């Protein structure tokens, strides 16, 4: 061991490339990439120096970082001698999304200039197809640099014949970015969600693909627009199922009998991201608390759960284990000693441990809620808890829906809610400012085309202010470029800001519009707090329908809820042109708030309903 041997350092990466020490260069690259990963794209903790001009110019500094990196990576991967170890290959692909952003936030856009150095046919006649030699390493290197922004052709079928695993590894990588918003990236991912599921169904386990981003592929498919987007989840469940049976010694529990604590059947709750300052607590804690009238509640979580989070349960434990196997054995054991009646996950998808537990039999009744609002396509999950006014069509779910009364999940108000108001109802609009509250995952070509259409068609001048949640470090310059590619001078893409700065941005707006397909919840609550109105789009998925449900709870009129994109555009334009109509509507909402009603209701039905299914099951 040597002092400083694992410190990510741009100059060290560059010296290793300059010296043609391919091994030290690759490892120095992996150090920078995994740090990007830990920082969620932030560049803090990566040593580098910059021209003094960039001292206070954070975005320029970032683009400079991406540019130094892209040019070192260009030298390295263009060298025909480079041979990447096999640990190396799988490591580069888990991190592909950080290479993607390194190129996408530099002026290079993508790594196609490296790919072209791998071509062998001097014809051909298509410039965008790359005829590699037959080396294994040539295929490996092509894949690593086959980024979402690539313009180069790719035939998945041909690739799947050559190598199933390498092909699945690339498919994983291309689904895992948190920003998949441009046409080029989004279309790539769209075809992969049609093509890939029936192929992933064929793998027999997770050993030679990038499993560490499995939850990313499991969640991100929901941000697509096709009716069958979740197909990948079903096939992912089958591989996860065959993995745990072969690689672990997985035995389901016999769930014929149940146990009791204080003469109540036991509900075991496995938590992910359940802190009292965050949305899962805010939305689901009250129903869990009231479920205690009928069940003894055991919460299983990590140390990120705060005291108020732990206090929702009669009993709380850290989920123990050093790998997936042990955690699953821990979870199994709690259900065993207590003889679980119910196994419940208010959120599934965000951690991998919940995804694995869903491919498992632990209790006779097993249910999820929509903390991440997408079906599981898992045979082992019987029900989905959901508010009745938020479901679109039941055919989007493989589970049977348990449709609770629209007031059966009262929310906990955030502690950060302002206690005072200062409503700005601008009478003299040269420009109509239109705010958008969105994470980066929610951005897509369709949504951005709609906004360009509103801008193009409205007879008033509009300006869009994006208050971006996700947007951060090396992600940001790329998002901003994507947004300018549609809206030019008609848009400002604000980086991530603290809640009170986020509120000031929206406070300077005249109306809002919501992203689609995957809408807002918090953004809507915020919009109403500030006395604003806007437009949303509804559809079949819960994540599409929520906005409709909420609009209605909050006393917004039906005409702000569009059914198609061209209605969305037409209603946005209307609300933008019709100054008086807009202001009257804002005065209306300021005077009549459903807000109150979100924070109260009868939280008892989830408990009642789980009791009923358990009693049915206990009868027979």
**Three-class SS of 213-270:** HHHHHHHHHHHCCCCCCCHHHHHHHHHHHHHHHHHCCCCCCCCCCCCEECCEEEEEEE
* 511 touches 428 (CB < 8 A): no
- Tokens 């299914």, residue located: 613
Residue 265: partners with Cβ closer than 8 Å, 6 or more residues away: 258, 259, 294, 295, 296, 341, 342, 611, 614
Q: Among positive and negative, which fits the CA dihedral 496, 500, 503, 505?
A: negative
Residue 109: count of CB within 10 angstroms of its CB: 19
- Tokens 């990576």, residue located: 73
Among 589, 602, 502, residue whose Cα is nearest residue 554: 589
* 335 touches 343 (CB < 8 A): yes
Experiment used for this model? X-ray
Bond prior to 361 in cis (omega within 30° of 0): no
At residue 482, the 3 state secondary structure works out as helix
CA distances in angstroms from 91 to 34, 46, 97, 169, 459, listed in the order given: 9, 19, 12, 10, 52
Separation CA 17–CA 113 (nearest Å): 18
* 223 touches 180 (CB < 8 A): yes
Among 455, 618, 427, 423, residue whose Cα is nearest residue 527: 423
At residue 280, the 3 state secondary structure works out as helix
Q: Among positive and negative, which fits the CA dihedral 411, 412, 415, 421?
A: positive
Residue 440: count of CB within 10 angstroms of its CB: 24
At residue 304, the 3 state secondary structure works out as coil
Separation CA 517–CA 396 (nearest Å): 14
Separation CA 573–CA 460 (nearest Å): 9
Separation CA 321–CA 529 (nearest Å): 43
Separation CA 370–CA 348 (nearest Å): 8
At residue 114, the 3 state secondary structure works out as helix
* 126 touches 103 (CB < 8 A): no
Spell out the alpha helix ranges (H) of 458-510. 476-487, 499-507
- Tokens 């202010």, residue located: 465
* 98 touches 37 (CB < 8 A): yes
Length of the chain measured in residues: 620
For residue 599, what is the DSSP state?
T
For residue 431, what is the DSSP state?
E
Among 378, 346, 213, 186, residue whose Cα is nearest residue 281: 346
CA distances in angstroms from 144 to 192, 317, 409, 554, listed in the order given: 17, 40, 45, 48
Residue 210: partners with Cβ closer than 8 Å, 6 or more residues away: 90, 93, 94, 169, 172, 173, 176
* 259 touches 338 (CB < 8 A): yes
- Tokens 């975005």, residue located: 59
CA distances in angstroms from 568 to 433, 450, 535, listed in the order given: 17, 8, 7
Residue 387: partners with Cβ closer than 8 Å, 6 or more residues away: 403, 404, 405, 406, 408, 409, 549
* 105 touches 471 (CB < 8 A): no
For residue 474, what is the DSSP state?
G
Q: What is the DSSP track for 361-405?
A: --SSEEEEE-SS-S----TT--EEEEEGGG---GGG-SSEEEEE-
- The phi, psi pair for 342, rounded to 5°, reads -130, 135
Domains defined along the chain, listed by start: 1-216 (no CATH), 265-408+600-620 (3.40.50.11380), 409-599 (3.40.50.2000)
CA distances in angstroms from 602 to 278, 424, 474, 585, listed in the order given: 22, 35, 45, 30
Separation CA 294–CA 300 (nearest Å): 19
Separation CA 233–CA 200 (nearest Å): 10
Residue 557: partners with Cβ closer than 8 Å, 6 or more residues away: 585
Bond prior to 125 in cis (omega within 30° of 0): yes
- Tokens 């609300």, residue located: 575
Among 520, 193, 544, residue whose Cα is nearest residue 396: 544
CA distances in angstroms from 71 to 60, 75, 89, listed in the order given: 16, 6, 20
Burial of 299 (0-12, 13-18, 19+ CB in 10 A): buried
């Amino acid at each position: 061991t040597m002092e400083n041997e694992n410190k990510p350092n741009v100059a060290n990466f560059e010296a290793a490339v300059a010296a043609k020490d391919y091994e030290k260069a690759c490892s120095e690259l992996l150090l920078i990439l995994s740090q990007l990963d830990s920082n969620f794209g932030g560049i803090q903790e990566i040593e580098f120096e910059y021209p003094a001009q960039l001292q206070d110019l954070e975005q320029e500094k970032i683009v400079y970082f991406c540019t130094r990196m892209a040019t070192a990576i260009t030298t390295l991967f263009s060298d025909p001698v480079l041979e990447i170890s096999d640990l190396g290959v799988q490591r580069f692909l888990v991190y592909q999304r950080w290479l993607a952003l390194i190129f996408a936030s530099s002026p290079f856009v993508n790594a196609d200039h490296i790919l072209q150095t791998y071509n062998r046919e001097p014809n051909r006649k298509n410039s965008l197809e790359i005829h590699l030699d037959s080396s294994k390493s040539s295929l490996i290197k092509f894949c690593i640099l086959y980024l979402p922004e690539s313009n180069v052709n790719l035939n998945l079928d041909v690739m799947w014949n050559i190598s199933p695993e390498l092909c699945a590894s690339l498919c994983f990588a291309l689904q895992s970015p948190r920003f998949i918003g441009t046409s080029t990236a989004f279309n790539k991912r769209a075809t992969i969600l049609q093509w890939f599921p029936r192929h992933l169904d064929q793998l027999k386990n997770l050993n030679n693909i990038p499993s560490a981003i499995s939850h990313d592929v499991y969640m991100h498919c929901s941000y697509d627009t096709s009716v069958n987007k979740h197909d990948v989840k079903r096939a992912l469940n089958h591989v996860i199922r065959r993995h745990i049976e072969s690689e672990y010694g997985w035995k389901d529990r016999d769930v014929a009998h149940i146990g009791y604590r204080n003469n109540k059947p036991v509900m075991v709750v496995l938590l992910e991201h359940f802190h009292s300052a965050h949305s899962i607590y805010r939305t689901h804690s009250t129903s869990m608390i009231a479920a205690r009238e009928h069940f003894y509640l055991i919460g299983l979580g990590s140390p990120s759960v705060d005291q108020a989070g732990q206090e929702v349960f009669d009993e709380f434990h850290l989920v123990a284990g050093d790998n997936m196997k042990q955690k699953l054995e821990f979870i199994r054991s709690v259900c065993e000693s207590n003889g679980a009646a119910i196994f419940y996950m208010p959120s599934i998808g965000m951690d991998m441990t919940t995804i694995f537990a869903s491919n498992t039999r632990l209790a006779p009744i097993q249910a999820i809620a929509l903390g991440h609002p997408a079906t599981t396509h898992s045979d082992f999950i019987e029900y989905v808890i959901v508010e009745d006014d938020y479901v679109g069509s039941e055919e989007c779910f493989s589970e049977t829906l348990l449709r609770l009364p629209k007031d059966a999940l009262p929310y906990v108000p955030s502690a950060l809610a302002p206690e005072k108001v200062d409503y700005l109802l601008r009478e003299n609009p040269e420009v109509v400012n239109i705010g958008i509250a969105s994470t980066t995952m929610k951005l897509n070509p369709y949504f951005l085309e709609a906004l360009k259409a509103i801008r193009d068609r409205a007879k008033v001048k509009v300006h869009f202010h994006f208050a971006l949640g996700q947007s951060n470090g090396i992600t940001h310059p790329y998002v901003e470029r994507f947004i300018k590619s549609y809206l030019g001078d008609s848009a400002t893409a604000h980086p991530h800001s603290p809640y009170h700065q986020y509120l000031r941005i929206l406070h300077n707006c005249d109306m809002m519009v919501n992203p689609f397909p995957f809408g807002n919840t918090n953004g809507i609550i915020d919009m109403v707090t500030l006395g604003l109105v806007g437009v949303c789009k509804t559809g079949a998925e819960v994540h599409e329908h929520i906005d409709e449900g909420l609009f209605k709870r909050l006393g917004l009129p039906e005409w702000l809820i569009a059914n198609t994109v061209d209605e969305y555009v037409e209603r946005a334009v209307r609300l933008a042109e019709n100054h008086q109509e807009r202001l009257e509507l804002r005065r209306y909402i300021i005077e009549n708030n459903g807000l109150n009603t979100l924070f109260t209701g009868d939280p008892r039905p989830m408990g009642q309903v789980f009791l009923e299914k358990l009693n049915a099951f206990l009868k027979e």
